[PDB]
Design a protein around this motif. Structure first.
Motif, PDB file in Angstrom:
ATOM      1  N   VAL A 121       0.871  -1.160   0.000  1.00 60.60           N
ATOM      2  CA  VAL A 121       0.000   0.000   0.000  1.00 60.60           C
ATOM      3  C   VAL A 121       0.914   1.217   0.000  1.00 60.60           C
ATOM      4  O   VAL A 121       1.676   1.434   0.939  1.00 60.60           O
ATOM      5  CB  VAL A 121      -0.946   0.028   1.210  1.00 60.60           C
ATOM      6  N   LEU A 122       0.840   1.991  -1.076  1.00 57.72           N
ATOM      7  CA  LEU A 122       1.703   3.149  -1.260  1.00 57.72           C
ATOM      8  C   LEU A 122       0.922   4.394  -0.867  1.00 57.72           C
ATOM      9  O   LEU A 122      -0.093   4.717  -1.475  1.00 57.72           O
ATOM     10  CB  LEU A 122       2.162   3.232  -2.718  1.00 57.72           C
ATOM     11  N   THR A 123       1.378   5.094   0.165  1.00 57.11           N
ATOM     12  CA  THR A 123       0.591   6.198   0.685  1.00 57.11           C
ATOM     13  C   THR A 123       1.478   7.341   1.206  1.00 57.11           C
ATOM     14  O   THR A 123       2.637   7.437   0.824  1.00 57.11           O
ATOM     15  CB  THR A 123      -0.419   5.692   1.752  1.00 57.11           C
ATOM     16  N   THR A 124       0.941   8.209   2.055  1.00 56.05           N
ATOM     17  CA  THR A 124       1.706   9.382   2.481  1.00 56.05           C
ATOM     18  C   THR A 124       2.323   9.183   3.858  1.00 56.05           C
ATOM     19  O   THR A 124       1.861   8.354   4.646  1.00 56.05           O
ATOM     20  CB  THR A 124       0.837  10.633   2.542  1.00 56.05           C
ATOM     21  N   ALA A 143       5.429   4.608   2.938  1.00 53.29           N
ATOM     22  CA  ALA A 143       5.281   6.055   2.770  1.00 53.29           C
ATOM     23  C   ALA A 143       6.036   6.529   1.536  1.00 53.29           C
ATOM     24  O   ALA A 143       7.221   6.230   1.369  1.00 53.29           O
ATOM     25  CB  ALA A 143       5.789   6.798   4.012  1.00 53.29           C
ATOM     26  N   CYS A 144       5.356   7.300   0.695  1.00 48.83           N
ATOM     27  CA  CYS A 144       5.903   7.700  -0.588  1.00 48.83           C
ATOM     28  C   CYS A 144       5.833   9.204  -0.758  1.00 48.83           C
ATOM     29  O   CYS A 144       5.664   9.701  -1.869  1.00 48.83           O
ATOM     30  CB  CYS A 144       5.135   7.012  -1.719  1.00 48.83           C
ATOM     31  N   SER A 145       5.970   9.931   0.348  1.00 50.01           N
ATOM     32  CA  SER A 145       5.977  11.388   0.298  1.00 50.01           C
ATOM     33  C   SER A 145       7.366  11.916  -0.049  1.00 50.01           C
ATOM     34  O   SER A 145       8.382  11.303   0.299  1.00 50.01           O
ATOM     35  CB  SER A 145       5.523  11.984   1.631  1.00 50.01           C
ATOM     36  N   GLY A 146       7.391  13.046  -0.744  1.00 50.14           N
ATOM     37  CA  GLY A 146       8.625  13.738  -1.060  1.00 50.14           C
ATOM     38  C   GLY A 146       8.834  14.858  -0.059  1.00 50.14           C
ATOM     39  O   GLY A 146       9.154  14.596   1.099  1.00 50.14           O
ATOM     40  N   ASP A 147       8.646  16.101  -0.499  1.00 46.81           N
ATOM     41  CA  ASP A 147       8.785  17.253   0.390  1.00 46.81           C
ATOM     42  C   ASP A 147       7.594  17.402   1.327  1.00 46.81           C
ATOM     43  O   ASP A 147       7.734  17.914   2.438  1.00 46.81           O
ATOM     44  CB  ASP A 147       8.940  18.543  -0.422  1.00 46.81           C
ATOM     45  N   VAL A 156       9.077   9.653  -6.004  1.00 50.72           N
ATOM     46  CA  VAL A 156       9.390   8.921  -4.783  1.00 50.72           C
ATOM     47  C   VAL A 156       8.727   7.558  -4.792  1.00 50.72           C
ATOM     48  O   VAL A 156       9.344   6.575  -4.419  1.00 50.72           O
ATOM     49  CB  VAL A 156       8.918   9.675  -3.533  1.00 50.72           C
ATOM     50  N   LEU A 157       7.462   7.499  -5.201  1.00 50.39           N
ATOM     51  CA  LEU A 157       6.761   6.212  -5.301  1.00 50.39           C
ATOM     52  C   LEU A 157       7.586   5.221  -6.135  1.00 50.39           C
ATOM     53  O   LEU A 157       7.932   4.093  -5.694  1.00 50.39           O
ATOM     54  CB  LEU A 157       5.385   6.450  -5.931  1.00 50.39           C
TER      55      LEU A 157
END
Ligand SMILES: NC(=O)c1ccc[n+]([C@@H]2O[C@H](COP(=O)([O-])OP(=O)(O)OC[C@H]3O[C@@H](n4cnc5c(N)ncnc54)[C@H](OP(=O)(O)O)[C@@H]3O)[C@@H](O)[C@H]2O)c1
Ligand SMILES: NC(=O)c1ccc[n+]([C@@H]2O[C@H](COP(=O)([O-])OP(=O)(O)OC[C@H]3O[C@@H](n4cnc5c(N)ncnc54)[C@H](OP(=O)(O)O)[C@@H]3O)[C@@H](O)[C@H]2O)c1
Ligand SMILES: C[C@H]1CNc2nc(N)[nH]c(=O)c2N1
Ligand SMILES: C[C@H]1CNc2nc(N)[nH]c(=O)c2N1
Lengths: 237, 237
Positions: A121-124, A143-147, A156-157
């Protein structure tokens, strides 16, 4: 200045080579189908014949991971497929990765029940912990958040998948997710089946959303069958 | 089950033959361009290169009449084009026909000012007389209603053109008009340029409207150029 295309080679074995991933590095391929008048749905299955099913299954067979948006989730390999995958050094069945900004996935979901292995599960960053606790035993939550900890960064994902040895990526939708990949210019290749139908004005496109770009792509190949489908492969840039 | 398409013949002279109209009877051809992700606009000109301009101009050269919806109106031939047209027994320049249900066209319109000959205005029985009076000297106004004097019947429209020796019909839009032709199944052929771009979710399709059909078409040809455009021709049924 114009040249006529025609059938020149019966595809011998040879198909996977036409759809090869690069030997190294991450690569995000999309596979979609649309009508001549640009409609993606009728679902898209009504427009998909045996040829398209064959290509669709091949692209799944070649992928390390299949990335899908959560709207669309609301992966089978047969013996030969598993063999081929093992020979190429891959897992027997590709991983599924579900993209969600909100993380609002239920345990009672069809997606978690009929699989050999736990999807990703790809999320923030912001919802990763709670999502991780709610989906314990069912999914690995990444977690696939950048800035911004409240959003998913597509680059990032892709990097998070690569970092887990899942560099050969396939996405089959839906249109919102694809629209974000296109908007952020992280889509490396689009395989598109053009089905020989017109469907009229109601249907949505294969991409939706507010994004607006003009990304030039190169035509790598066009295949066809007797039914008049075009199976195309376009690559950046 | 799949065959590879490739370049096999440099188009010698030979192009008009690939786009020939039938020797007798009415024939409604559409010509549109769209992105790989099914978007029709960026206007569509930004996606159109020299090859597409060449095909576009050829299709105009072959047509008896070009039918356009009034949204889109808000026709040049050069010497050689005129020659070819005269040899084939056609008027030097194709007629323009503008479709309007309301008939609410202004005399002060760009469409009426820069032409060699008065366009046709295709409208309903209900507004034909008033429209005829307002556009006196500028346009021939033709009622194209079927059973209902308040609507345009597409089959009747096509028949009204044929009845005037304009049986070879081209339409270039817009998406509402095309959507009605598709919805009513009176479109005989779609020539579609597939431009090698993705544009993201904002753009509309080449057809819009409430209609929903599943009309099978046959792939007559696919041409290409070095830039990776596909110039396709599909025909009912
Ligand atoms: O709807 P549909 O038919 O268009 O199919 P879809 O793309 O598969 O579904 C869209 C949904 O998947 C998630 N999603 C898609 N793109 C995303 C992105 N770039 N970042 C975070 N989440 C994303 C969102 O779920 P969430 O609303 O759960 O965030 C979104 O509402
Ligand atoms: O707008 P757009 O971008 O989609 O371009 P467009 O199709 O060229 O413009 C649409 C307009 O042209 C007329 N039109 C299109 N299809 C028609 C039909 N089947 N019957 C009667 N009139 C038709 C209507 O004008 P009117 O609103 O003047 O009737 C309509 O509002
Ligand atoms: C759900 C969509 C997704 N993407 C696809 N791509 C091809 N080529 N064929 C399909 O049926 C589909 N189904
Ligand atoms: C306005 C649109 C209409 N239809 C078209 N068809 C092709 N092939 N190319 C265009 O630029 C256009 N312009």
């Amino acid at each position: 200045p114009l040249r006529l295309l025609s059938s020149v080679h019966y595809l011998t074995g040879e198909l996977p080579q036409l759809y090869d991933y690069p030997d190294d590095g991450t690569w995000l391929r999309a596979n979609f189908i649309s009508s001549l008048d640009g409609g993606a749905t009728v679902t898209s299955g009504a427009m998909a014949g045996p040829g398209d099913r064959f290509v669709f299954n091949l692209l799944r067979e070649l992928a390390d991971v299949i990335v899908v948006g959560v709207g669309t989730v609301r992966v089978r390999m047969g013996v030969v497929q598993r063999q081929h995958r093992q020979a190429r050094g891959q897992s027997e069945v590709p991983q599924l990765a579900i993209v969600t900004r909100s993380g609002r996935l239920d345990r009672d979901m069809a997606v978690f029940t009929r699989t050999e292995m736990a999807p990703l599960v790809l999320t923030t960053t912001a919802v990763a912990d709670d999502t991780r606790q709610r989906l314990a035993g069912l999914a690995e939550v990444i977690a696939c958040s950048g800035d911004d900890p409240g959003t998913v960064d597509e680059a990032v994902l892709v990097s998070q998948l690569a970092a887990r040895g899942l560099r050969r990526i396939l996405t089959e939708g839906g249109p919102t997710l694809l629209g974000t990949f296109v908007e952020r210019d992280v889509l490396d290749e689009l395989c598109l089946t053009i089905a020989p139908y017109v469907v009229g004005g109601l249907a949505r496109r294969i991409v939706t959303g507010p994004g607006q770009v003009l990304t030039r792509m190169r035509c790598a190949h066009v295949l066809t069958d007797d039914s008049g489908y075009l199976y195309t492969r376009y690559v950046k840039t």
